[PDB]
Structure formats: structure tokens, C-alpha cells
């Protein structure tokens, strides 16, 4: 109060069903996510730091390990 | 009682409301 007006950022912690996939480009990250109401067309890829399940995330590779980069992790 | 998963879809902007 009585300070900046505000007029930037409304980030929200959308409910999350489950991670999709998962794909990198440019050098970022970015998680396919299904969102609750929203029509499963109105897909969109959120960046990982944003994403505030990362039990959600440890789900999706927990299935395709025990053979994934097959090495520590 | 424990919080469910949540991830922000980087909504931003402003809800139109009514």
C-alpha cells in the first residue's frame, strides 16, 4: 500500500493433473501440463522454476527411468 | 489438508470479470 502501482506479473498456481512430456529449446525448460476446466486444446508447455509440483514432475520420469540416461540420477 | 500440486501457467494479464 501507498507504495509502486501495481501493473505487471498475475502468475497463478493453476491446479496441475499431470506433466505430459517434457522438451528444451533455446536452453530453457518447459513441461507439457493439463489444466483443469481449460479444454485439453488450450495445451501450453509452463518452464519447470515456474512450476510449483515437483512431485508431479519426479511422476513422469519415475516411469520412463530405470533406463533413462542410464547412468546416476 | 496437505496442498495439492499447483503449477502457474503463466497466466498474467488481468481476468475479464463482469
Partial sequence: ?73 | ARTKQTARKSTGGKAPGG
Fill in chain 1, 1 to 73: 500500500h501507498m507504495v509502486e502501482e501495481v501493473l505487471e506479473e498475475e502468475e497463478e498456481e493453476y491446479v496441475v493433473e499431470k506433466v505430459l512430456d517434457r522438451r528444451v529449446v533455446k536452453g530453457k525448460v518447459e513441461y507439457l501440463l493439463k489444466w483443469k476446466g481449460f479444454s485439453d486444446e488450450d495445451n501450453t508447455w509452463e518452464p519447470e522454476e515456474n512450476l510449483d509440483c515437483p512431485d508431479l514432475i519426479a511422476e513422469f520420469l519415475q516411469s520412463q527411468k530405470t533406463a533413462h540416461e542410464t547412468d546416476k540420477s
